[PDB]
């Protein structure tokens, strides 16, 4: 009887009254999936939420997302009735239903009361990372698709291919603040993996500002002067001047060199019109020197990061906001977009292919002669076409670097190619030297269906013409990448599965333990120059003991000191190269770690809390890149041999030899 209730025991599942049906199982009530069925796949289905398609909305402030009016009604009714009878503008809640039944304007104003400062949380289905769960403020958009702030999509790693988001609603007081707290977009502007700004200006934004801070030889107004970036506005947004003219302006820049006060320092720069207008964007605290650069995707990356480490977060946040609007703003003001007249093939390409023909034709005759073997000529074909491609490269790249020669104080004078494709190769947005070589030049040698390399490259160029055989070689590679995504994704979740299955309950429970013990952080100088330096390993930790300088007994960093930006800069100035740092495994704290042994680095940059469970976040951030995972010695530098751990002996002719396998060759 007991058994039949549970799992029919394990004796056999005796059927029920004259029926093909085992007696009922509460085991099949306490062992289904993940134990029970809330926690199992399929438990619940979120209320106060909406799974809806997405869309841009280039005007959305960094702190707000867009929600459809129809969706709004459906999701906030209870709050709408809670309001309609807490105040009392509705007769009854039944008549309240009848008001939304009639779509009466009154309840839409009560809808304004339940949304205009009531934040929401957002999430996508394919999301495997914590950076895919964020919060914004709602904005009543009449439509059907959830809009967003453009650049945040890169965080969710969500393009516009059918990303249906389930936007959640923090009902309780707690969750509402928690949204605007840690889950606010404007706060997790750093990656828990590395202390760098998680969002890098995409590309539309950057070409707009590439066209802002920009140098062109033909400049209208090239020489005038201004006293205010505001009248700069009145010159280009009007149309009388160019956005590139070399104007001498007085930028009275500021610097928080005081105890929090931005010191006044006057200065005039040989800047371009757009950079003056870029100052209207750049907050005083941030200096004009960093923004007197052509602005690339990587430049603008560290650009936002400096504004943070120096001036702060608030400036940076509303600054990047400014950037977004003006990034796309002058992207329009850009005009120049694409040119067929730019994609010119040099008659040097056709010339080297002529050589690349005659050459292997002779090398094939060396085969009909028996000098080079099939295999030696196999790699030989590889050999000269490689050289041939690099020579054609040496042509198409210089063509696309100095060829824009417009008149100015003479007959002609060069400037960096104004050729749009090159602009994407300068801003480094989405046009790289290899992609360029693959449209306007010979692709190169490709992988064969076996995985090895076919001796013959893709002869011509895609921009012009090839045939299906050349195509089959290329089809391999394309289909290659495809297969990869298709499998990697599933195993990543399963990887983080076993990962959470091992770390979940690890919580930081103390701050300081009571031990000097830590481990050794070292730059893994292997092969050539260091692969992974000293600084980035120390970034966000605490020195084990009172560390000395090469000068003995001169402590450059006392035992318990948090090593952040400035101290990392400090450990890069000193000659110290090996730093013992307190480790999370050497932590004296049992059943947890101390704030010190951990550090500060996360989305935050402050001391890790007592209550912050590092266990789970460790898991996800190591499994986040899961989807991503797949002769003589003559150095070309200048140093000096410092033989280590080896007995070297002089022989005849005064030369030197090595008597062991343990041999590191240093380059002091």
């Amino acid at each position: 009887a007991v058994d039949a209730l549970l799992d029919n025991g394990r004796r056999g599942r005796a059927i029920t009254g004259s029926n093909k049906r085992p007696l009922k199982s509460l085991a099949d009530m306490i062992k289904g999936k993940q134990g029970r069925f809330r926690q199992n796949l399929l438990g619940k289905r979120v209320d106060y939420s909406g799974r809806s398609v997405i869309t841009v909305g280039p005007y959305l402030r960094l702190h707000q997302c867009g929600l459809p009016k129809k969706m709004a009604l459906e999701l906030f009714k209870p709050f709408i009735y809670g309001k309609l009878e807490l105040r009392g503008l509705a007769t009854t809640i039944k008549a309240a239903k009848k008001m939304v039944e009639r779509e009466e304007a009154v309840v839409w104003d009560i809808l304004d009361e339940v949304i205009r400062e009531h934040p929401v949380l957002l999430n996508r289905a394919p999301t495997l990372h914590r950076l895919g769960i964020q919060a914004f403020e709602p904005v009543l958009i009449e439509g059907k698709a959830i809009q967003l702030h453009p650049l945040v999509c890169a965080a969710y790693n969500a393009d516009f291919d059918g990303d249906q988001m389930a936007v959640h609603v923090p009902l309780t007081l707690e969750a509402q603040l928690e949204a605007r707290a840690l889950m606010m977009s404007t706060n997790n502007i750093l990656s828990p993996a590395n202390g760098e700004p998680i969002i890098v200006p995409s590309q539309d934004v950057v070409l707009g500002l590439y066209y802002m801070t920009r140098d062109c030889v033909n400049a209208k107004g090239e020489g005038m002067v201004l006293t205010g970036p505001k009248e700069a506005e009145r010159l280009y947004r009007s149309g009388l001047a160019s956005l590139h003219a070399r104007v001498k302006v007085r930028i009275t820049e500021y610097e928080k060199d005081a105890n929090g006060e931005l010191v006044a320092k006057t200065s005039l720069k040989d800047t371009t019109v757009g950079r003056a207008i870029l100052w209207m964007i750049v907050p005083k605290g941030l200096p004009y020197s960093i923004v007197n650069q052509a602005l690339g995707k990587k430049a603008i990356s560290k650009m936002l990061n400096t504004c943070y480490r120096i001036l702060g977060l608030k400036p940076t946040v509303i600054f990047a906001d400014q950037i977004m609007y003006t990034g796309f703003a002058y992207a329009a003001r850009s005009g120049a977009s694409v040119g067929i007249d730019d994609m010119v093939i040099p008659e040097k390409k056709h010339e080297i292919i002529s050589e690349a023909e005659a050459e292997v034709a002779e090398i094939q005759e060396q085969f009909q002669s028996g000098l080079v073997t099939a295999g030696e000529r196999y790699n030989k074909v590889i050999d000269i076409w490689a050289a041939a491609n690099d020579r054609v490269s040496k042509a198409m790249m210089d063509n696309l670097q100095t060829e824009t020669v417009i008149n100015r104080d003479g007959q002609e004078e060069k400037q960096v190619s104004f050729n749009s494709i090159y602009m994407m190769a300068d801003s480094g947005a989405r046009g790289s030297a290899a992609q360029i070589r693959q449209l306007a030049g010979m692709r190169g040698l490709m992988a064969k269906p076996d995985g090895s390399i076919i001796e013959t490259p893709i002869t011509a160029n895609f921009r012009e013409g090839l045939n299906v055989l050349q195509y089959f070689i290329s089809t391999h590679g394309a289909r290659k990448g495809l297969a990869d995504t298709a499998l990697k994704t599933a195993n990543s979740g399963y990887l983080t599965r076993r990962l959470v299955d091992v770390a979940q309950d690890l919580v930081v429970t103390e701050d300081d333990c009571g031990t000097h013990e830590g481990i050794m952080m070292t730059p893994v100088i292997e092969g050539g120059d260091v692969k992974e330096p000293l600084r980035d390993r120390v970034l966000g930790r605490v020195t084990a003991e009172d560390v000395l300088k090469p000068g003995t007994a001169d402590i450059l960093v006392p035992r318990n000191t948090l090593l952040h930006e400035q101290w990392c800069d400090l450990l890069e100035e000193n000659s110290v190269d090996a730093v013992k740092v307190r480790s999370v495994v050497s932590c004296d704290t049992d059943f947890g770690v101390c704030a010190h042994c951990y550090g500060r680095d996360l989305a935050r940059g402050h001391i890790i809390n007592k209550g912050e469970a590092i266990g789970v976040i460790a898991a996800q951030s190591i499994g986040e890149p899961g989807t991503q995972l797949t002769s003589s010695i003559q150095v070309k530098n200048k140093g000096s041999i410092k033989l280590s751990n080896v007995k070297s002996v002089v022989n005849s002719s005064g030369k030197l030899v090595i008597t062991s396998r343990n041999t590191e060759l240093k380059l002091i």
Binding site: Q34, K44, P68, F160, M324, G335, F472, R479
Partner: protein, 1327 residues
């Protein structure tokens, strides 16, 4: 050259390569493969004739009532396609097979007494193939992808460095069967020739040789030779056999004439063997050492002494040979084996089967089969003979023995089906030979070991399943019968056939409903390859191997058109110009180049023959006749693109599309544009939306005509003639008599599909293109369909596009669109939905369709009629009532207060309730047609009587044509005969038609006879063809048309590969205008051009702008009303294009009313035909831009749509052709948070279905485990949406507005406590 459609719109031919390969029936792979299947052939055509021969005469044991084969015959198509489409019954022909049932005589030379030949007896139906390539079985047309697998024959594989993982590379082989079993061959560097059956364990070759009983010496002589050794005058001499010296180290003096040829030190290779053959001296002195160590063949104990010391096959040494030489033996027969080449494999296989008899050998073979159970000698022997030797078991048709012998380098392509040991053991000996070095292995990508069993071929094999399944119901009626009891249709049945051929045509893995939204997608679904086939391949094993593509597929297979997920390299498409071979291979067009001139002799090859011949390239410059302008042409020896000569060519690639597929042909300027936008390009082409106005491509390829016409979305004519009664729903053609049937005259009637439902619920409607008062040509077109216009594949629409990053509205993928499109709605799709209504008799209440609804008002019936069916023409939404459904309720549902009123009022009042068919929340619709399907026998009331009466008149209106036309012919005929019987001309005009007189009155009546017997016919289908499913014989299907438009969030793309999603569709007010003031329509991102490399995409933009540029010329000057000659001048520039090759210009027939009319057609753009490997060049596109009103660069000066300042450095503009994937906002927006979960538990309702909320994933779980706030996840999946009472306690709480709660033990959690509280471990909560 010019047709009646080419007088309307001729496709401007770019014309570079001369016409030589004419488009044949591109779907013979379907039809003619099916033609090899079903066809009357005394010859024995591989199909139905060969199959029923290969099995009939069917004789069984001790019955002797042998059923034999004659022929077969088909029934009539059961309906027309249209009815098989609407109703949904299998489009088939009842197979009537001619069978000969004869009974023999026991104890006599078998005499036939009763030769009762029951011809055309019912052996089930067989779905017929409609003459387009589809199957109309259940509703809409479904399709089956022909599949590839290893071809029957013999093949070699190596597995080099993958059979040892140490350095020992193997070379093994498998003998592929057709209809039988495999014979696997384990060959290893371990010097062992093992055999295995199909995929079984490791057996020695000799486990069956001894199991046929061949002793060691009968084994080692057939395989290995006998080197005859001579011992004379007590000295060892070797009769030198130089060929047996292949692979051996010269460790002794190999001297002839004293002159040492092969010396001691350097071994024997190949030159010194010939130095022995140079002077033919075959006698060498071998030290005693050399022979000491070889195996003897015969029994050589001491025949001079008298003792038995050894047995046979035992070594010789400085002991045993020292006895055979002092005794006196000269001739000693040994056996040959060596180490380098010929290894002692069979020697190292004998004693692996530790038996010396067939008895225990078979025990060993059966012990290999299954363990534990007893092997019997009798059962094993009978088994073997009836396996590879029994014919109904093993087979290898003209395919088996063909590739068998050709891989054996033999000559015969034919032979037996059952195995022949001569041939088998040759393979085994050659197996050794490949595991030596003398002979190599093959690849799997060589199509010689690849057989594509087509749709009809595969059908024969599936039908074979059916044939044997019921053959067990035949042979046993031959055993349980006597003499004449068993008759055809007493033995044979119908269901097995149904659950066999339909099992293939409707239940096969490659058989599924044709994605009907793009005629192209319909054709490529038909003409397609499937690597995942029956006895083929799977993807959970292959990592990427099956997926990559080999170069021997050059010319017949196209990889471009394939999906994106795990189905890459699995669901590949074929090449346009491919042709079905009988063996299951392919035959591909190659122009026979007779050493100089490229003759039009077109030969056919497969990868077998490609590997043997050298074929020239087609992209090479040839002069006039075919004599290459250059001394060279890049040819391919085995698929080797290299420098070859003008005289080394055997064949030459025919046309530019002999390798191209329909999907890639549609994409112009291939040679250019990147392969990735190409894959994803043809990808999105199988997703072209069926828009209302189907705009034809400005710049095309010529395949536009080749899809819109070669699909089933067009009403083609088998005859030509003046249109008689063109309507929207019917196309009556008054056919010309030179092609009109001399048998019962004839006219062409075509009922067009009218706004019906498709597979993808999108409106499909053939539209009448030909207007009244215009004849047609035979094989021409009368109707178009969606995604097609005037017989031209029109997927989307093309218009003014500009390239510029405009205020973030082109961010990452975003496209910017002008409000004009939705303001025109020329881009709207109509999704119609069919909602089946289940009803009809439950055991508790005979269900009716409501006819009354309780406890509500007459509003629910003011929209319905007395029947309860909603009137045709309304519009529903939200949760309206469509049709009413009666449904039994229950005594349980009634109270004692209303059990008193049941004794008064009646039984059927509160017994059945109203649980009608309702519209779930979130669904809109427009009733356009409500199809009720009456129970056969018991029809409905007056409402259904109006519907049946409607289709009855729909039959009368069409049945009238047939009559009328001969009634006129014959009447004028009457008008001339009666005058010969006494003039009555004016009189007959005033007299009744009943005035050859006998004959004509007759024909008149026969047509009228036909008239009524067809009304009867049609009405029969209408009245009793409504039976659907057993039990539920009354099903009410309602259609709901819902127009879905373009809006902020739609996914728009292009053919070229570029994708996009509309960010914010702005008013046309914000459109950048040119020097003239023309508003742009689309704005795209320029930043994607360099990366994605969409170059051909922009070139088609300029020629598209040129196709409209010339239109600009025409239009202006045409509004001025100028003569037909002026425009003609522009047309001539427009038809010479430049000064290159051709276009086949006008002025053959009168160009007055042809080109001035063609001008009314070209004042909107010009459809161009274009080759993909040598298409429009720079100066060619420039010639056309400058012929209109356009500048060189095509970079026009536009002013800001919001300001007016010119975009610096003019923006590149033009006209791009679009492509809208079917991904709509309506389809993925699931705005439900809560509506209702389930009924039995709190289980979700669907995943992609209605009432959609976020399916809480487990990855989502771990992310929420990362964020330090447990609380929000805590409540989210326990307190909220888990505690059935806890969220209602929260509902009743937040409808006040005060977030404040307590912990949440999920009650079932308290049952966990209770269950172990029931065991003994009583969990508590102390303090």
């Amino acid at each position: 050259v010019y047709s009646y459609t080419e007088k309307k719109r001729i496709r401007k031919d770019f014309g570079k390569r001369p016409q030589v390969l004419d488009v044949p029936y591109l779907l013979s792979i379907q039809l003619d493969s099916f033609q090899k299947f079903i066809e009357q052939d005394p010859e024995g055509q591989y199909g139905l004739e060969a199959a029923f021969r290969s099995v009939f005469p069917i004789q069984s044991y001790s019955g002797n009532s042998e059923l034999q084969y004659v022929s077969y015959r088909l029934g009539e198509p059961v309906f027309d396609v249209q009815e098989c489409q609407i109703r949904g019954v299998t489009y088939s022909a009842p197979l009537r097979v001619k069978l000969r049932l004869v009974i023999y005589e026991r104890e006599a030379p078998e005499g036939t007494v009763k030769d009762i030949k029951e011809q055309e007896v019912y052996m089930g139906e067989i779905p017929l193939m409609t003459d387009n390539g589809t199957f109309v079985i259940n509703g809409t047309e479904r399709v089956i992808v022909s599949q590839l697998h290893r071809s029957p024959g013999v093949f070699f594989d190596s597995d080099k460095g993958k059979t040892h993982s140490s350095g020992k590379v193997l070379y093994n082989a498998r003998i592929i069967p057709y209809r039988g079993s495999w014979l696997d061959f384990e060959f290893d560097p371990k010097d062992n020739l093992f055999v295995r059956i199909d995929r079984r364990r490791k057996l020695p070759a000799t486990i069956i040789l001894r199991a046929l009983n061949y002793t060691t010496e009968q084994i080692l002589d057939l395989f290995f030779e006998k080197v005859i050794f001579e011992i004379r005058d007590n000295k060892l001499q070797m009769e030198l056999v130089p060929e047996r010296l292949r692979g051996e180290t010269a460790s002794f003096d190999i001297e002839a004439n004293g002159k040492v040829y092969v010396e001691k030190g350097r071994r024997i290779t190949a030159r010194h063997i010939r130095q022995l053959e140079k002077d033919d001296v075959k006698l060498i002195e071998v030290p005693v050492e050399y022979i000491a160590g070889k195996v003897v063949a015969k029994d050589y104990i001491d025949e001079s002494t008298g003792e038995l010391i050894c047995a046979a096959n035992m070594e010789l040494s400085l002991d045993l040979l020292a006895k055979l030489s002092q005794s006196g033996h000269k001739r000693i027969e040994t056996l040959f084996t060596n180490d380098l080449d010929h290894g002692p494999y069979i020697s190292e296989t004998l004693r692996v089967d530790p038996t010396n008899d067939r008895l225990s050998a078979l025990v060993e073979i059966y012990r290999m089969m299954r363990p534990g159970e007893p092997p019997t000698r009798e059962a094993a022997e009978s088994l073997f003979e009836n396996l590879f030797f029994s014919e109904d078991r093993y087979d290898l048709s003209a395919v088996g023995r063909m590739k068998f012998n050709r891989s054996l380098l033999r000559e015969e392509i034919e032979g037996s089906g059952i195995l022949s040991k001569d041939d088998i053991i040759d393979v085994m000996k050659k197996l050794i030979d490949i595991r030596n070095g003398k002979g190599e292995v093959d690849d799997i990508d060589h199509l010689g070991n690849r057989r594509i069993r087509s749709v009809g071929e595969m059908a024969e094999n599936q039908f074979r399943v059916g044939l044997v399944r019921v053959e067990r119901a035949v042979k046993e009626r031959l055993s349980l019968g006597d003499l004449d009891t068993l008759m055809p249709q007493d033995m044979i049945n119908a269901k097995p056939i149904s659950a066999a051929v339909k099992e293939f045509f409707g239940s096969s893995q490659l058989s599924q409903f044709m994605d009907q939204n793009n005629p192209l997608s319909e054709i490529t679904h038909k003409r397609r390859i499937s690597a995942l086939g029956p006895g083929g391949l799977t993807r959970e094993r292959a990592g990427f191997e099956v997926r990559d593509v080999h170069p021997t597929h050059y010319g017949r297979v196209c990889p471009i058109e394939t999906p994106e997920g795990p189905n890459i390299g699995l669901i590949n498409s074929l090449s346009v110009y491919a042709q079905t071979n009988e063996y299951g291979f392919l035959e591909t067009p190659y122009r026979k180049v007779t050493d100089g001139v490229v003759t039009d002799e077109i030969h056919y090859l497969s990868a077998i023959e490609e590997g043997n011949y050298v074929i020239a390239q087609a992209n090479s410059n040839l002069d006039e006749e075919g004599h290459f302008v250059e001394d060279l042409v890049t040819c391919r020896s085995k698929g080797e693109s290299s420098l070859f000569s003008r005289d080394q060519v055997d064949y030459m690639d025919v046309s530019t599309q002999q390798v191209v597929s329909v999907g890639a042909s549609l994409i112009p300027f291939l040679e250019h544009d990147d392969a990735n936008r190409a894959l994803m390009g043809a990808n999105m082409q199988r997703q072209a939306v069926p828009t209302l106005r189907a705009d034809k491509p400005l710049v095309g390829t010529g395949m536009e005509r080749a899809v819109a016409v070669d699909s089933g979305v067009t009403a083609v004519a088998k005859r030509g003639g003046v249109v008689q009664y063109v309507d929207a729903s019917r196309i009556v053609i008054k056919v010309n008599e030179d092609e009109m049937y001399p048998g019962e005259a004839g006219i062409d009637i075509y009922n067009l599909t009218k706004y019906t439902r498709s597979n993808q619920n999108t409106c499909i409607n053939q539209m009448p293109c030909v207007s009244l008062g215009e004849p047609v040509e035979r094989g021409d077109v009368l109707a178009d369909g969606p995604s097609t216009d005037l017989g031209e594949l029109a997927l989307g629409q093309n218009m003014r596009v500009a390239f510029m990053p405009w205020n973030g509205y082109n961010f990452e993928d975003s496209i910017l669109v002008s409000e004009r499109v939705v303001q025109e709605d020329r881009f709207t799709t109509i999704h119609i939905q069919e909602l089946a209504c289940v009803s009809r008799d439950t055991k508790l209440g005979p269900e009716e369709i409501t006819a009354d609804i309780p406890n509500v008002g007459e509003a629910a019936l003011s929209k319905l009629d007395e029947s309860g069916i909603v009137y045709i023409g309304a519009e529903v939404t939200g949760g309206d009532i469509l049709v009413g459904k009666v449904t039994p309720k229950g005594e349980t549902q009634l109270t004692p207060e209303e059990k008193l009123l049941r004794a008064i009022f009646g039984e059927k009042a509160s017994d059945v309730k109203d649980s009608s068919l309702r519209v779930p929340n979130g669904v809109s619709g427009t009733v356009i047609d409500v199809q009720v399907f009456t129970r056969d026998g018991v029809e409905k009331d007056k409402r259904a009587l109006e519907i049946e009466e409607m289709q009855l008149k729909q039959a009368k209106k069409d049945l009238s044509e047939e009559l009328q036309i001969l009634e006129a012919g014959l009447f004028s005929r009457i008008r001339a005969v009666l005058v010969a019987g006494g003039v009555e001309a004016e009189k007959l005009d005033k007299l009744p038609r009943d005035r050859q007189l006998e004959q004509l009155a007759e024909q008149y009546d026969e047509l009228k006879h036909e008239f009524e017997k067809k009304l009867e016919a049609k009405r029969r289908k209408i009245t009793q063809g409504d039976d659907l499913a057993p039990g539920v014989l009354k099903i009410v299907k309602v259609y709901l048309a819902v127009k879905r438009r373009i809006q902020p969030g739609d996914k728009m793309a292009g053919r070229h590969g570029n994708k996009g999603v509309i960010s914010k569709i702005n008013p046309i007010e914000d459109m950048p205008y040119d020097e003239n003031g023309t508003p742009v329509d689309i704005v795209l991102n320029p930043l994607g051009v360099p990366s994605r490399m969409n170059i051909g995409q922009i070139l088609e933009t300029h020629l598209g702008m040129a196709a409209k540029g010339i239109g600009d010329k025409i239009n202006a000057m045409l509004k001025q009303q100028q003569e037909v000659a002026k425009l003609r001048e522009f047309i001539q520039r427009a038809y010479d294009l430049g000064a290159d090759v051709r276009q086949k210009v006008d002025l053959s027939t009168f160009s007055d009313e042809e080109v001035m009319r063609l001008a009314e057609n070209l004042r909107k753009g010009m459809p161009i035909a274009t080759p993909v490997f040598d298409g429009a060049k720079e100066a060619e596109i420039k010639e056309l831009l400058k012929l209109g009103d356009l500048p060189t660069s095509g970079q026009i000066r536009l002013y800001d749509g919001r300001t007016g300042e010119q975009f610096e450095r003019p923006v590149t503009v033009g006209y791009m052709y679009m492509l809208k994937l079917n991904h709509l906002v309506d389809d993925k927006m699931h705005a439900r948070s809560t509506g209702s979960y389930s009924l039995v538990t709190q289980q979700p309702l669907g995943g992609k279905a209605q009432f959609g909320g976020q399916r809480f994933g487990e990855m989502e779980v771990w992310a929420l485990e990362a964020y330090g706030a447990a609380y929000t996840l805590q409540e989210m999946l326990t307190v909220k949406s888990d505690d059935v009472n806890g969220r209602t306690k929260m509902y009743k709480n937040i409808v006040d507005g005060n977030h404040q709660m307590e912990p949440g033990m999920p009650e079932s959690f308290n049952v966990l406590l209770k269950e172990i509280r029931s065991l003994g471990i009583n969990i508590e909560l102390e303090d």
